[PDB]
Structure 1
Amino acid sequence: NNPAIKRIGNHITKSPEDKREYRGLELANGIKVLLISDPTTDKSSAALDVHIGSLSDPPNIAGLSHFLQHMLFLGTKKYPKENEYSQFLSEHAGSSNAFTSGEHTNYYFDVSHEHLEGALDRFAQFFLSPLFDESAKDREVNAVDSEHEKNVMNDAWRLFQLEKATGNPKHPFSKFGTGNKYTLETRPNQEGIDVRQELLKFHSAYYSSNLMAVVVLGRESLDDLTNLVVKLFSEVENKNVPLPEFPEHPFQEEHLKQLYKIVPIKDIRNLYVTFPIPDLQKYYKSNPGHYLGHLIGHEGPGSLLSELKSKGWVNTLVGGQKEGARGFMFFIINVDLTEEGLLHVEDIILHMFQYIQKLRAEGPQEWVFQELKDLNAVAFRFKDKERPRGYTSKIAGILHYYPLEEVLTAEYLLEEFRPDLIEMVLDKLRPENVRVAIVSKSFEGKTDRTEEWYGTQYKQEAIPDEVIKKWQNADLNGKFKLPTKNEFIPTNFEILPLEKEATPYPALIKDTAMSKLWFKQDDKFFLPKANLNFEFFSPFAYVDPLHSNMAYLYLELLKDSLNEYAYAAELAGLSYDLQNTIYGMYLSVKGYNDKQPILLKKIIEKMATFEIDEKRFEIIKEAYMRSLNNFRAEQPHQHAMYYLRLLMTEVAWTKDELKEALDDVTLPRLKAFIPQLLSRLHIEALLHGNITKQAALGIMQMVEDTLIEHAHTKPLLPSQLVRYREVQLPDRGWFVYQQRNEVHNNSGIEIYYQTDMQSTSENMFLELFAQIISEPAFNTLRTKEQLGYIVFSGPRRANGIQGLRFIIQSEKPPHYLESRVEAFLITMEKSIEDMTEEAFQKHIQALAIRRLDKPKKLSAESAKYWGEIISQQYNFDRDNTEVAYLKTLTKEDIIKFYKEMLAVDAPRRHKVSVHVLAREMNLSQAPALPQPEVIQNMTEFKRGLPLFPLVKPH
């Protein structure tokens, strides 16, 4: 035996397709541990989840655990450099993050497989000897203030806290998880709190070993990982902390039968119906709430959503069980509202209860349970291999809930059929404990309350008793039926033998005027799945704002019309994705290959013989108007990025231009557009997965054939296959475009240093430079200078051209952000000069590892190929080519590069900046900048400049 280990679990049940190896165990200090050994893996990973979270904040210091989560990254006793951790990761091809829910704090990272031990050692120190440096705390508190500022004007975050503020304020549920500058500094200072103590106190009280789960994944054997984990983690001290419980629901009697009217930020209409329920988590083997979710949330014929959608009152619905914390859960049903639907909220809920009643009337249904259990068993067997960071983070979390042996299956497999639990949860979905929330702009001015944290305007009301009764006496309604056998359930899982002529990259197997078929049968993953991707080209999908609107509308109407039929396939692991592009349309069909050709044929056939329902047209149109308008409520950085897309692309229709042109969109006009669009096309497809050359040609040909038979599609001409170019910027020039965000009181900035076209050479100069500056940018602009929560840098790539970019969202003005990036950029040339050839070579090696990391799942491989095909570079072997070339570069290559294209006095510096100002408008040396040329009109700017070439295909 071994003193450090309390036990090794028995065999960990995995899918029989999972080649990875697993060992579970419990340390002597009580920490639950999963070990994953994957000798193939390119990146390694570890995560730790602690069963404590914002629900355990001192009442008097809101968001202390979320703050503590930020601080652990910023220095321990053993590795005291503020950024040892994030720099060690950067230089060895890793990344990291954390999050805090009300009951968990979850920390994970990935790294190159050679450096797991180094990564992990630095990591353990978080849980033993964090420094909470006084100077780090002062600074990092602003990052948290930004995190919340971001969220303040977000409609989902406000609704989330508003729920917490209307249950029992005495309950921990009512707490503010995020914290801000106010709750973390201003106010604790006023009240003579030393926050460094309070962080040391909270860390020491709750970061106890008995409350921790670790997962590690690496190339090492299971024995090697064991020794490793034991070594680094046995010294975490066990304080035997009792795990927090919340037996009492935060919605007590007086919180039930309430109605709330709420004003949103975006122009949206929504109804949130919600009942309290007990903790259902222990019933995971039978899962009563999933069963009722499957049903109430169903979207097929017969379903609740269906009648709500035919009465033209709602558009979408979600319902099912919602997590609470240990002790309570909720059951929700929320829908959005047509303008008509808003005036029928009473009737909508009554339909809701008529449906619930139908379920009571029919009793539990084993055949539905069998169906659910079967889908999940299939889902489990053929689960795609996950990226290791996500996987460890996830499993660390759930080690807290399941026996070691079941950690892999517990969330998937079903075992027990429980008509009793089903009937019991069903007894709680009653008018006597309902909550109703309506979110609409029409409550503007009519509100009397304000939510402290986010500022939400709202009104609370008792639901009239006769209203409750009307709901209590819900009749059956003959429009509601249980769903019938799901015919889309796959049964054929045969993995076709690997062909004689199969290749490692996709092959151009068809090159006609109508279509260009790229194909690869799967040589890696061997699951009964495929992806079938299609670009359809029409110059009419974007010839003008009007047309762009129509392509959009057409596609939403089609998706809406297929929804009832398609929902079945989606439960059966077969889904599709269909949207309009600036080039025509896109279509992806993904999942188990068995019934895949059925659904595809149904889609094309529909596309080509489409009949629009006047009622449905009118609603989607209204919903689209709002959507375009709602862009004004998007975040300042998302705005900045948007403007820069509009400014650098040859052709691009502005949200305003679409909004305006959307009124000339009549039903007559739409009916005429469809056959026009569908009459001349080109198709470029990539077919990839468990399929053969001959089946692939058949599928492609069936698509074409359907379009001819029904829309008379003829091929498009080679010269009409027009791709849009990027604006070419003048050597030494600098432009600024300035706009205002009228909703958020932060500002946004995008700075673009354009370089040259994409070419093996020019590609890797940019990438290495980005790699070297990646963490220092984060570390300088955020950690040190605390300019904002959002601080991004990296390559930008569009229409075959490229360049470096910075994105910041900040409280300080853009002219200010400009200058500190510039400051930073000098710091950088200064660093490349001072760095060891070996430091230089580490960065080369990290980019190397990132670039070469093998896809772990089909979808991921497809994506890499598709990027090659949509960009028309067709460079399928690019990763080996570009990497070979990378290893050839030297410090002087990169300085020359920075001196030519990037330094402030660079002979070919091409700088464009988007400044997005807020609602309302020591440190390194910043260089003196030129008078920028302020862009007045986006069209003029474009007319007056060269356009770039397009990239030659490989």
Structure 2
Amino acid sequence: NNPAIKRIGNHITKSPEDKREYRGLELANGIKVLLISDPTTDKSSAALDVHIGSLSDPPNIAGLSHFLQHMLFLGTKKYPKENEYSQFLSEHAGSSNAFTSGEHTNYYFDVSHEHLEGALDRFAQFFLSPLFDESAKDREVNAVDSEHEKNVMNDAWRLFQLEKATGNPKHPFSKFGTGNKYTLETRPNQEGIDVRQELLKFHSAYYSSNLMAVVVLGRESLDDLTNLVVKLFSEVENKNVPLPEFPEHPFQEEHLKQLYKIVPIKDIRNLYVTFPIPDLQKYYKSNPGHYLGHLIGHEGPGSLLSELKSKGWVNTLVGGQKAGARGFMFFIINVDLTEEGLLHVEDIILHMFQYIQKLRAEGPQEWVFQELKDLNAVAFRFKDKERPRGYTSKIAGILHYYPLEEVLTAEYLLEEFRPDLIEMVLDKLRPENVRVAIVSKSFEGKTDRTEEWYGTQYKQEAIPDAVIAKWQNAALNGKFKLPTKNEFIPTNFEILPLEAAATPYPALIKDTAMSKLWFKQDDKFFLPKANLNFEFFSPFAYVDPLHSNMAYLYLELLKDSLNEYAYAAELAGLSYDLQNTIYGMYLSVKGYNDKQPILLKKIIEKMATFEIDEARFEIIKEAYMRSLNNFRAEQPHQHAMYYLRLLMTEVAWTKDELKEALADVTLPRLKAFIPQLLSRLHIEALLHGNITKQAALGIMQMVEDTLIEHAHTKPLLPSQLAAYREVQLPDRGWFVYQQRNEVHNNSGIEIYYQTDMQSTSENMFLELFAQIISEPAFNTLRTKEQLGYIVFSGPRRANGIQGLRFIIQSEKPPHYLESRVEAFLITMEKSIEDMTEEAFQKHIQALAIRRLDKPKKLSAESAKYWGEIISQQYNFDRDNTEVAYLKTLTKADIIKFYKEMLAVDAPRRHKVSVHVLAREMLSQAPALPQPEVIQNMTAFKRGLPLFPLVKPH
């Protein structure tokens, strides 16, 4: 009947809790499509995933498919303006990104639901007639180069490429996927390559309809979405391109039984054990690799990790299957190493093989399979509603792997018990097939090879035949046992009726010396889950660096101690987060409500009766010292943000101060600290989800009673509930703080234009200005001027105060970056003067949509309320109130705000800049004043006033 549609799928299986409607189809040209109708959505979304990626780059142009991914955003025949796409999205509350992996290039956006067709039309042209403009190409190659640079000193990226470089060099797996200025411009120029032509040729050859999948989500009916996708995508040409396949494993015989010794950037110690395996993707209905990963990676009693930790050799372990490409996969067992563990790598690996042998001895267990199946079924049924942008992008990828009807369920529902496949995979996990990599600063000076793209220093050796033989002879170790039945699996999914007195926002249902309890029974999502958030206030968590260290160590030790018990709950969809803060402690328990009070009670009890194991203490102390030292290897822009935080906040201990005080933390001292920390507390909580008022009051009082019983906790005084203030900068002031990053050879800058205390009017002046300049800042400072890959602008909010911030990471010196940001601000003032009234209203509407966008899941709603609570503003109806005010603003209002607070000659300009120098280190910019250079943070803060704190709503 319809020539443009090859087939329409049968019913797309979905959760009975999922109210979105679905239709799958395949266009005549071979594009697989999922349409998603959600008449409730505030943002609509589309994604397209092409089944081609960096494994297919020309061997003489590394990075081409990734470079092409960048270039597709920079103009098409129908929409030739370089930022037409980005500008359109920004002006309609939208956003976009993309990525390139070895076999996929995935593009996605969201946008206001009223402007889906406009966004999708501009998007579709990417796949029809990109311009690959010569000038755009010359500029954007710099962004890719800066992307690569950012990764160069990153340990994870270095290991990622090292693995590729130590397999078969003839295999496409060995390719460098990012590319850089050298591979994408310098070398091609030397070799007479016309890169524009190569981009065109690659697009023409591989961007074929037959290798594409598209997903569109909007308020429109499935019929209207259908007509829309046919209309825009049926014109993509089918070149009938064979799907690339890689049946030959990158790791052949000569790449097995090998040991690599590797020097990291950070002071880290890790062991990576890898086995090549066949591609298991086609076995998704049984998932033999996940079965084995579940067991080998278990953290409960009897597990591999439990014994390795008890021996004091490792702290964490990750195990299971790892994607490769079509035709090959890996199975891994990776662990971190204590100091002793580093000396016992051969033994650690022997235990790995002993655990594997236990699996072989017991044989495949149907009951384990059944647990995994049951948990996946529950996870699928009660899955949180996803944000459209991530949902479309994800589905577009998986449409390539599953029948239309199964795309939603394929990754969840298990159907087949396959002991034959389990055995088959287990038979690959043998010493004769192993690769071993050790990462440690101890190899410094002892290496003889260098990886070309990152400079990674390493040594390769054959593993001795005697070592292999010992591993092959691994016997059963009595410490290893299969997990027992998971008692945390939930079975009560009853949704409690909405109470007569239920409220739309959290209500304060308890207000006592000890505790403040905000409660809301879920009235939106109706899944059997709840979030229980607690802030524990105590002066002794942050009184000095020593105590801040002890608060940290106490909670790390506590989590380490509960891990074995809590791991079963985590598998069963019940998790917790526990951490020290500048005001005390933060605890959040989330997931299925059924067994939640059991886990919560256990945590609080353990907190209040904690007994420290001395060996765990020393190990965790050493790891924490390294974590503090390792900050030196974070990126320049992360440094800049950190320094700004220290500068602008009333109290803040530096990493240097923490690590100095760490040597003074002894076991007796930590033992004394805990009862003192818990002796006086105030608890402010948000309990939100599938729970009644009475259950909420009972959970709160259970927590209190537990601390009272075991820690003799008494209430803090109201005056001790002190929040920290932000430093108040002087009118017309400019301060600069300058540091150097010793690891990275890029600079970082953060510029902060402090405005005033948060309030309805001040919030919306700043947010509207930020909205207006958001896309132009990126377009100007990155796309045109190419200062770096990382270019950010937006509101900065802290301690009730706010202002406008810019963050850039660049090869250029910070003083140069400063001048270009100042040039840009003048550009924006003229831009606002020149923009039409309607363009101004569009920005108001875009901000409005962004602010009113409804949470799709419980934790998103909880996060908003929690923000009101921890800031102590308690403005639960903020979005309505602030958007109402926003809509009354005029161009004149914003120009005046800029002239008063932001302009270079503004009477109330309050500017502080953090300059982070690299390791070794156009519109007209205005002349700037001489800055006051900050020499000492403490003296800086002492010599300035402190803002007031914002008053509660």
Structure-2-length-normalised TM-score: 1.00
Tell me, in whole angstroms, the C-alpha distance in 1 between the residues paired with 2:279 and 2:475.
Answer: 30
Q: How far has the Cα of 1:875 moved from its partner?
A: 0.1
1:614 corresponds in structure 2 to 614
Tell me, in whole angstroms, the C-alpha distance in 1 between the residues paired with 2:477 and 2:703.
Answer: 41
2:514 corresponds in structure 1 to 514
Q: Deviations over 1:768-809 (max 9, x none)?
A: 000000000000000000000000000000000000000000
Q: Does 1:952 align with 2:939?
A: no
Q: Deviations over 1:644-692 (max 9, x none)?
A: 0000000000000000000010000000000000000000000000000
Tell me, in whole angstroms, the C-alpha distance in 2 between the residues paired with 1:812 and 1:615.
Answer: 47
Q: How far has the Cα of 1:896 moved from its partner?
A: 0.3
Q: How far has the Cα of 1:707 moved from its partner?
A: 0.2
Tell me, in whole angstroms, the C-alpha distance in 1 between the residues paired with 2:477 and 2:920.
Answer: 53
Tell me, in whole angstroms, the C-alpha distance in 1 between the residues paired with 2:831 and 2:194.
Answer: 37
Q: Deviations over 1:181-240 (max 9, x none)?
A: 000000000000000000000000000000000000000000000000000000000000
1:893 corresponds in structure 2 to 893
Q: Deviations over 1:831-886 (max 9, x none)?
A: 00000000000000000000000000000000000000000000000000000000
Q: How far has the Cα of 1:607 moved from its partner?
A: 0.1
Q: How far has the Cα of 1:50 moved from its partner?
A: 0.2
Q: Does 1:219 align with 2:210?
A: no
Tell me, in whole angstroms, the C-alpha distance in 2 between the residues paired with 1:275 and 1:903.
Answer: 60
Tell me, in whole angstroms, the C-alpha distance in 2 between the residues paired with 1:259 and 1:305.
Answer: 22
Tell me, in whole angstroms, the C-alpha distance in 2 between the residues paired with 1:397 and 1:354.
Answer: 38
Tell me, in whole angstroms, the C-alpha distance in 1 between the residues paired with 2:663 and 2:832.
Answer: 56
Q: Does 1:281 align with 2:281?
A: yes
Tell me, in whole angstroms, the C-alpha distance in 2 between the residues paired with 1:624 and 1:505.
Answer: 40
Q: Deviations over 1:276-313 (max 9, x none)?
A: 00000000000000000000000000000000000000
Q: How far has the Cα of 1:578 moved from its partner?
A: 0.1
2:929 corresponds in structure 1 to 930
Q: How far has the Cα of 1:530 moved from its partner?
A: 0.0
Tell me, in whole angstroms, the C-alpha distance in 2 between the residues paired with 1:464 and 1:452.
Answer: 27
Q: Deviations over 1:330-389 (max 9, x none)?
A: 000000000000000000000000000000000000000000000000000000000000
Tell me, in whole angstroms, the C-alpha distance in 1 between the residues paired with 2:766 and 2:621.
Answer: 43
Aligned length: 953
Aligned residue runs from structure 1 range 173-572, under 5 A: 173-572=173-572
Tell me, in whole angstroms, the C-alpha distance in 2 between the residues paired with 1:467 and 1:718.
Answer: 64
- SS of aligned partner of 1:353: helix
- SS of aligned partner of 1:777: helix
Q: Deviations over 1:418-452 (max 9, x none)?
A: 00000000000000100000000000000000000
Tell me, in whole angstroms, the C-alpha distance in 1 between the residues paired with 2:219 and 2:477.
Answer: 59
Q: How far has the Cα of 1:558 moved from its partner?
A: 0.1
Q: Does 1:778 align with 2:778?
A: yes
Tell me, in whole angstroms, the C-alpha distance in 2 between the residues paired with 1:292 and 1:312.
Answer: 25
1:27 corresponds in structure 2 to 27
1:144 corresponds in structure 2 to 144
Structure-1-length-normalised TM-score: 1.00
Q: How far has the Cα of 1:920 moved from its partner?
A: 0.3
**Percentage identity across aligned positions?**
99
Aligned residue runs from structure 1 range 625-644, under 5 A: 625-644=625-644
Q: Does 1:792 align with 2:818?
A: no
- Structure 1, unaligned runs of 5 or more: none
Tell me, in whole angstroms, the C-alpha distance in 2 between the residues paired with 1:699 and 1:137.
Answer: 59
Q: How far has the Cα of 1:722 moved from its partner?
A: 0.3
Tell me, in whole angstroms, the C-alpha distance in 2 between the residues paired with 1:89 and 1:750.
Answer: 26
- SS of aligned partner of 2:865: helix
Tell me, in whole angstroms, the C-alpha distance in 1 between the residues paired with 2:442 and 2:887.
Answer: 62
Q: How far has the Cα of 1:564 moved from its partner?
A: 0.1
Tell me, in whole angstroms, the C-alpha distance in 2 between the residues paired with 1:663 and 1:260.
Answer: 33
Tell me, in whole angstroms, the C-alpha distance in 1 between the residues paired with 2:56 and 2:905.
Answer: 54
Q: How far has the Cα of 1:642 moved from its partner?
A: 0.2
- SS of aligned partner of 1:739: strand
Q: How far has the Cα of 1:829 moved from its partner?
A: 0.4
Tell me, in whole angstroms, the C-alpha distance in 1 between the residues paired with 2:478 and 2:935.
Answer: 61
Aligned residue runs from structure 1 range 55-204, under 5 A: 55-204=55-204
Q: Deviations over 1:134-167 (max 9, x none)?
A: 0000000000000000000000000000000000
- Structure 2, unaligned runs of 5 or more: none
Alignment root-mean-square deviation, CA: 0.2
Q: How far has the Cα of 1:477 moved from its partner?
A: 0.3
Tell me, in whole angstroms, the C-alpha distance in 1 between the residues paired with 2:502 and 2:940.
Answer: 49
Q: How far has the Cα of 1:536 moved from its partner?
A: 0.1
Q: Deviations over 1:559-590 (max 9, x none)?
A: 00000000000000000000000000000000
Tell me, in whole angstroms, the C-alpha distance in 1 between the residues paired with 2:718 and 2:426.
Answer: 61
Tell me, in whole angstroms, the C-alpha distance in 2 between the residues paired with 1:841 and 1:722.
Answer: 41
Q: How far has the Cα of 1:624 moved from its partner?
A: 0.2
Q: How far has the Cα of 1:933 moved from its partner?
A: 0.2
Q: Deviations over 1:887-942 (max 9, x none)?
A: 00000000000000000000000000000000001x10000000000000000000
- SS of aligned partner of 1:844: helix
Tell me, in whole angstroms, the C-alpha distance in 1 between the residues paired with 2:49 and 2:3.
Answer: 24
Q: How far has the Cα of 1:413 moved from its partner?
A: 0.2
Q: How far has the Cα of 1:416 moved from its partner?
A: 0.2
Q: How far has the Cα of 1:743 moved from its partner?
A: 0.1
Q: Deviations over 1:696-747 (max 9, x none)?
A: 0000000000000000000000000000000000000000000000000000
Q: How far has the Cα of 1:37 moved from its partner?
A: 0.1
- SS of aligned partner of 1:676: helix
Tell me, in whole angstroms, the C-alpha distance in 1 between the residues paired with 2:555 and 2:198.
Answer: 55
Tell me, in whole angstroms, the C-alpha distance in 2 between the residues paired with 1:870 and 1:287.
Answer: 43
Q: Deviations over 1:464-501 (max 9, x none)?
A: 00000000000100000000000000000000000000
Tell me, in whole angstroms, the C-alpha distance in 2 between the residues paired with 1:311 and 1:835.
Answer: 68
- SS of aligned partner of 1:245: coil
Q: How far has the Cα of 1:124 moved from its partner?
A: 0.2
Q: How far has the Cα of 1:128 moved from its partner?
A: 0.2
Tell me, in whole angstroms, the C-alpha distance in 2 between the residues paired with 1:452 and 1:80.
Answer: 38
Q: How far has the Cα of 1:406 moved from its partner?
A: 0.1
Structure 1 stretches of 4+ with a deviation exceeding 3 A read: none
Tell me, in whole angstroms, the C-alpha distance in 1 between the residues paired with 2:549 and 2:833.
Answer: 52
Tell me, in whole angstroms, the C-alpha distance in 1 between the residues paired with 2:452 and 2:881.
Answer: 57
Tell me, in whole angstroms, the C-alpha distance in 2 between the residues paired with 1:520 and 1:289.
Answer: 41
Tell me, in whole angstroms, the C-alpha distance in 2 between the residues paired with 1:522 and 1:133.
Answer: 52
Tell me, in whole angstroms, the C-alpha distance in 2 between the residues paired with 1:228 and 1:372.
Answer: 40
Q: How far has the Cα of 1:39 moved from its partner?
A: 0.2
Tell me, in whole angstroms, the C-alpha distance in 2 between the residues paired with 1:273 and 1:833.
Answer: 61
Tell me, in whole angstroms, the C-alpha distance in 2 between the residues paired with 1:247 and 1:220.
Answer: 42
- SS of aligned partner of 1:163: helix
Q: How far has the Cα of 1:828 moved from its partner?
A: 0.4
Tell me, in whole angstroms, the C-alpha distance in 2 between the residues paired with 1:701 and 1:304.
Answer: 38
Q: How far has the Cα of 1:640 moved from its partner?
A: 0.1
